[PDB]
Each structure stands twice: as structure tokens, then as C-alpha cells.
Paper text:
Molybdenum insertases (Mo-insertases) catalyze the final step of molybdenum cofactor (Moco) biosynthesis, an evolutionary old and highly conserved multi-step pathway. In the following synthesis steps, MPT is adenylated yielding MPT-AMP that is subsequently used as substrate for enzyme catalyzed molybdate insertion.
We found that the conservative substitution of Cnx1E residue Asp274 by Glu (D274E) leads to an arrest of MPT-AMP hydrolysis and hence to the accumulation of MPT-AMP. To shed light on the molecular function of Cnx1E residue Asp274 with respect to magnesium ion coordination, we proceeded to solve the structure of the Cnx1E D274E variant. The overall structure of Cnx1E variant D274E resembles the Cnx1E wild-type structure published recently. As a notable difference, no interpretable electron density is visible in the variant structure for the region comprising amino acids 269 through 274. The disordered region 269 to 274 was confirmed to be highly dynamic in D274E through ensemble refinement. In the wild-type structure, residue Asp274 interacts with the octahedral water shell of the catalytically relevant magnesium ion and is therefore involved in its coordination. In Cnx1E wild-type, this active site loop partially covers the putative MPT-AMP binding site.
Author numbering:
A (entry chain A), B (entry chain A): 16 to 83, 96 to 129, 135 to 268, 275 to 307, 314 to 441
Write the structure that this text describes.
């Protein structure tokens, strides 16, 4: 048995960033940039008016002028975002003007040079680096790529993940009345969804029975298909099959929930494939995915910060620590204007009983409280470290 | 001009949750549940062994027994997750047993009733409500649906969003050398990406010129196509066209960045379509999308908490407040073990110059600092409210 910290260090040391690809602008969304992006022209590329009004020679000052290149004694109409004609050095917004006669315009104020003008390149200078390698592409970065005219982008791809379930007792989730000794396969749909939330392509390999030849054939098809990660759950015939096909780095971790977790590296007949022999118990299966698979997906996708967000929060109820195993205690956290100590902060409620077979303990859990192995009851209002496992922007108030 | 709070209250009052639909299990991921889900059978549906070992009569105690319904004086082999035979009331893990002879088994310990057995329904009782209406579906909820055998789910759908850009000066982002008075359309790709991040289908309506008949025809095609939301940017011919087609609730908001923002409700020739006439300036366009469109998408998708996560954080540098307009100041926030006051907390750095034309001010911005209109310089180490605008689980450490 190895601590979680060593198991992560081993996974980070074995895991390698995927080779970069060129994708279309909308396929680049969510991906990490594999090249720097430079503006080929300035923004704005011409002096642009900030307002609807008249382009003037600021020195002329208040007066009546004909509307027409702008020379002293003349003005020209401009619109927001339109170019300033040559010779004009300032814009007088339409509110500070009046049309005279049944074209002549009366400028009502004394303006200053460069007023209501965006000079060439004041938002983005030509050849300036607008985005760098290692930067994740969100909506604003798509806007910067579009501004710079980059519609084909070099990025790190997401890994392709194969997923299978193991068990003679499993039936498909479409099963109605269950026969003797049968349960619905819940890990596969759960892991397919968890991987879809990580924006990875999934290869669903179905239910495999507790049969060595059958599992070997499915693992071989997975390796041969070109996937980067294989997730199995249960049966940890899995560990011995992964030892035969490649290198197993660990098979047991000091943690609650669970204990078994096999991590292996296989060489395709060639690229390497990472394999996680996840525990069968639904809770341990999803907790191991959150702690060990998520940072691996991120690392393969070129994330420079693959680790999950860790915060400090206050317990809303007392929680019993385990005397030997450090726990990943499921919780529903929220930001409060008063966290219980007077100042604002995160607070956590337990999801109830934490048995590894109890999938209801994962229901609505947006964090994993890291409880050290002291054996003591942590009182309500005491502080703990917590790993955030679901979109912090989608957090309920 | 109306404050942002009133503009939001108006949008929340006009916006209506979409009619529910039935979708497949993987299409349900990310959606809000429109029905309660009940377990049709218990979990486990049979008494299940927690270990590999022997199902025994606990009262028999240590001794040698033949392996075979279990009666006193006999034992039966069981595997993890397999059913307990009738008559056995406890499981003795294989480590506390030994096979005797060249089948007979020696039970080495005195066990207690129900040891290493998951009784019928101990994880989920039959007919128990595992998920409720209004609950968002993540990976664990997909696992609970799969456990309960629900592969067709009643949910609230995401709205379909139409998007267009306006401007005689715009060219496609594929444009290489720009002609006089031309800029690349950056708002449309940015808004398509922002809406894709909200998991909504997009109808890309392209660039529309500053021509009343042309914009009317495109708005009519958008309304006729069945979309729930229309996003336009720039030209705010937009407001007068939205007044003619439906009801405009506001056209100007007291805020920095920007000022113009038209919100309208149109009736299709019938369902209602919400229209946001977003400001043309890239920054104002994305800030208005983050503040006003995101909670609208959520409300239409049946979210009971559509508001964004608001936290309290400390400034890493001084920031000048505006004397009249409350600002949505872009920042890069991170959780620190010491926020500057001794205890752990969020900290924020400004993205630099906040001009509405400067899209670089949105680059990597994961929060909007809510700066009240005091006109004073907020010193470094002082606290402010901040709206989190990007996945808190994807926050860089
Ligand atoms: N796909 C699955 N869905 C639900 N439960 C599972 C799945 N695979 C294994 N389990 C259960 O988790 C426990 C551990 O399984 P294993 O690691 O195969 O011994 C047993 O109670 C299994 O019935
Ligand atoms: N699609 C767009 N992409 C980039 N900039 C835009 C877009 N639409 C409008 N703008 C600019 O934003 C400012 C306001 O435009 P408008 O609201 O049309 O007056 C002007 O400087 C426009 O050039
Ligand atoms: Mg099994
Ligand atoms: Mg315009």
C-alpha cells in the first residue's frame, strides 16, 4: 500500500503530454494552445472613431464648417468604429454639434487632439503576442484568435478513453426485472459521463465477464484501436492481465474509500496507453476517477496546472476521522457570507453515510474533504482542506 | 439607464423555463431533472458478500466443515458482490479460512451475524427516491439513473441560441490582408464559443450589414427557425427593430464596461423568443453575456440557482473605482494558503487596462470584481465581491 501523494507522483511521472494537432477554431475551444499567437495587423488597423459625430482639426475650435481628406476649416461625418479621414485629429460627438441650413455643421465645443479616437493599434499592437503556448482556450481566447485571423489553431488534443465494466453479476442498465444474483452495470455509464464532462472522446467497450481470455481480447482491441487511456472497473483477473501486457506501478493505495487501484502503462504494437484498473465499488470507482484520472486527462491534454482546486472550508456538522486511512469524505459545499466564524467563507455538509457501496454518498457531492487519519471527531465549525470536483462556476448559492 | 440589479430582475421575471423533454441517458448529462426517480428494486437486490470467502452460520464458530442452501455444520464459497446462499447469515473472508484435505474448509475465527454481508437494500431501499426534480445531472446522477434502470430521462432542455454580428466594417475571421475600414468579426466566434461552453445548440447567422431590411429578414428567419434566444452584437438599427417585432424592457444599464444593452421578448408566429442586443465593443459584449445571458440560459434550462457564484477576495494590487458607474473589473483569481491577512483565501490580480475595446482585458479572466461607484482607489489587501465566470474546478493553483 502506497499513500495517495506517491500514487499521484507516479502517475504524473509516467503520464506524457499528447502530440499537438491543428484544429478548426471551434474545435480549439477547451484545448490548450500548442503555439504562440501573434496579431498580423493592429487593432484597430486604422484610427477608429469611438462615437457618431464629426472628425475635426481640434485647433479650429467652435464654429460653423462645411461637411466634406479633412483640412483646417472643414469636418467629416464619422460613425462608431469607422475610420478617421486623413487630416482630422479629433472627433466631436454628434451631441456637441448641430446641422445649420436647409451641408454645414456647427461645432459647439473646443476639443483636444485624439478625442474619441482609438489610434492604430491602441487595443492590440501589430506583431504583439495575444496568446501563448500552454494557455487554455475559453470564449475570450476564441475572440482573440478570431481578431488575429487565426481559424486553424495548433493545440494539444484530449486523450481518447476506452471504458469497460467487469462482472458475472452485471446486466445492462436497460434490464427491467433482475434475475438472481444480478445488478445493473452503473460504473460504465457513470465513467462514460465523467469522461464526457472532461471533454474526451469515449470508446464504450461494454460489460466483460470474469473470464481471463475474454478480458485479454477486449484489452487487446482497446490497445489496438488507438486510445490513450483505458478505464476498467471491478476485478482488482484485471491486475494480472495488466502485469502481463505492460508495467504495473501500484495496485493498492492507503485511502478511504477503498484500497485497490491498479495503474499500468502498456505499449501498443507504437504509442503508450495508460490503464486504470478502478475499484468495482461505485463510490471508490468515482473517487479514484476524480483524484487520479482527472489530473491524468489534464496532463495528456497539456494542462500546466492539472491538479484540482483545493480550498479551506468549515464543517457544518461533526465528522468522525478514520484511525488508519485518510478519507476523501464527500460533501456539498457552498460559499456563505458568514462561514460560522464571522467572516465570509466556504462551508461543507456531509452527504451522510460514506460506505464505498453507497452511490447516494456521491449524489450532489461537489467536493472531497481531505480528512487526515487521526481517529478523532472533527467538531462543527472546524476547518479542513477540500478538493473541488465539479464546476465552481456552476456552484449553487 | 437602470441599475444592473433591476435589469437582472426584469430578465428573471420575463424568462420562462422550457417545456421538458425525454432524452437518452447520455443526452441527460448536464441537464436538470424534470421528474423524481425511484429505485424499482433494492441495491443490492439480494444479500451480497463484501468479500471472497465462505458464507457460514455464525453460531457454528471455529471448525472444519464440508463445502456445499446452507445448513448448520456446512459452508459455501462466495465472491465479492455475489449472493449469500439461503441459511447462511455471515461471511468469513478467505484470509480467516484454510482448505483441508486432498472439499473441506477450516473456519479459523468466531464471526458475528451479518459480517461482510450487504443486506438487501442497505445501499438503496426499493421505491426510495434517488434523484428529485430540479436536480442537475452529473456523473454520479448518471450512475444512480443506471443503477435504477432509467435509460430514458425527463429533463429540461437547453435553449437553442441564434447568433449574429452587425457592421459594415466587419469581415470574416478568415480574412488575410484587411481592406480600408475593415476589422475581423471577433464577437460572433467569441459568443458561439461562450454559448457552446453553456452546452447550448448554436445557430450561426453570420455577419449582417448596417441595413434595416437585411437585419429584419435575418431576425425573422431566426424567430421562424424555433430558437429560444437571439444574440446580436453591435448597432445598439437593432433596438428600433426589436421594438417593432416585440417588447423592449430596457436599452441602457448603469455599469462599466459600456452602457447600451437591449433586452426584448418576441412572439414567434407560438412561443416566445428572448433577444439580447449586446453591445458591439468586444469586452462589453462578453461581460454582458456573462452577467445577463448566462443566468437566462440557466433559467430556461430549469436551474433553481441560475445566479453566478459570488465570493469575497483580496486585491493583489490597488484599483481605481469609477465615480459614477459600478465596474465589472476583469481579474485572474486564485486560492492562496495565505491571502495577505494570514488566513487562506482567494486573491485577485487585475488584467490591466479595462477599456471596452480591449479584448486582452478578458484574456484568462476567470472573475469580475464588483467595484462600487465611490471614485476612490481601493488599496492592495482590501476585500471586494467577485463574480466567478469560469469553471471553478478548472481553476489554476
Ligand atoms: N459496473 C459495476 N456497477 C456497479 N457495481 C459494480 C460494478 N462492478 C463491480 N461492482 C460492485 O463493486 C463491488 C466490488 O467488485 P469487484 O472489485 O469486482 O470485487 C462488488 O460489490 C460489485 O458487485
Ligand atoms: N463583431 C464584432 N467584432 C469586433 N468588434 C465589433 C463587432 N461589432 C462591433 N464591433 C466594434 O465595437 C464598437 C461598437 O460597435 P456598435 O455598437 O456597432 O457601434 C465599434 O468599435 C465596432 O467596430
Ligand atoms: Mg467483480
Ligand atoms: Mg456597428
Amino acid at each position: 500500500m502506497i499513500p495517495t501523494e506517491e500514487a499521484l507522483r507516479i502517475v504524473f511521472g509516467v503520464s506524457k503530454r499528447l502530440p499537438p494537432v491543428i484544429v478548426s477554431l471551434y474545435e480549439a475551444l477547451g484545448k490548450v494552445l500548442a503555439e504562440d499567437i501573434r496579431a498580423p495587423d493592429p487593432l484597430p488597423p486604422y484610427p477608429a472613431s469611438v462615437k457618431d459625430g464629426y472628425a475635426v482639426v481640434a485647433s479650429d475650435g467652435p464654429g460653423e464648417y462645411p461637411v466634406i481628406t479633412v483640412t483646417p476649416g472643414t469636418v467629416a461625418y464619422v460613425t462608431t468604429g469607422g475610420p478617421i479621414p486623413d487630416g482630422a485629429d479629433a472627433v466631436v460627438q454628434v451631441e456637441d454639434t448641430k446641422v445649420i441650413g436647409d451641408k454645414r455643421v456647427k461645432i459647439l465645443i473646443q476639443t483636444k487632439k485624439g478625442t474619441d479616437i482609438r489610434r492604430v493599434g491602441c487595443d492590440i499592437e501589430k506583431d504583439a503576442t495575444v496568446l501563448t503556448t500552454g494557455e487554455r482556450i475559453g470564449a475570450s481566447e476564441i475572440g482573440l484568435l478570431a481578431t488575429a485571423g487565426v481559424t486553424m489553431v495548433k493545440v494539444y488534443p484530449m486523450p481518447i478513453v476506452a471504458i469497460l465494466s467487469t462482472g458475472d453479476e452485471l446486466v445492462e442498465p436497460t434490464a427491467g426485472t433482475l434475475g438472481r444474483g444480478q445488478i445493473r452495470d452503473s460504473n460504465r455509464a457513470m465513467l462514460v459521463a465523467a469522461v464526457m464532462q472532461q471533454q474526451c472522446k469515449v470508446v464504450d467497450l461494454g460489460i466483460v465477464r470474469d473470464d481471463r481470455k475474454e478480458l485479454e481480447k477486449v484489452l487487446d482491441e482497446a490497445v489496438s484501436s488507438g486510445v490513450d487511456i483505458i478505464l476498467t472497473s471491478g476485478g482488482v483477473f484485471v491486475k494480472p492481465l495488466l502485469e502481463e501486457k505492460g508495467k504495473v506501478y501500484f495496485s493498492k493505495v492507503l485511502m478511504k474509500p477503498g484500497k485497490p487501484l491498479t495503474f499500468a502503462e502498456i505499449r501498443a504494437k507504437g504509442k503508450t496507453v495508460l490503464a486504470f484498473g478502478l475499484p468495482g465499488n461505485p463510490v471508490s470507482c468515482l473517487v479514484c476517477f476524480n483524484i487520479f484520472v482527472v489530473p491524468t486527462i489534464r496532463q495528456l491534454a497539456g494542462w500546466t496546472s492539472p491538479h484540482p482546486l483545493r480550498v479551506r472550508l468549515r464543517l457544518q456538522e461533526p465528522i468522525k476521522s478514520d484511525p488508519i486511512r485518510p478519507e476523501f469524505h464527500r460533501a456539498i459545499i457552498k460559499w456563505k457570507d458568514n462561514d460560522g466564524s464571522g467572516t465570509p467563507g466556504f462551508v461543507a455538509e456531509s452527504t451522510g453515510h460514506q460506505m464505498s457501496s453507497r452511490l447516494l454518498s456521491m449524489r450532489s457531492a461537489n467536493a472531497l474533504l481531505e480528512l487526515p487519519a487521526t481517529g478523532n471527531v472533527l467538531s462543527a465549525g472546524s476547518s479542513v482542506s477540500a478538493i473541488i470536483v465539479s464546476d465552481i462556476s456552476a456552484f449553487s448559492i
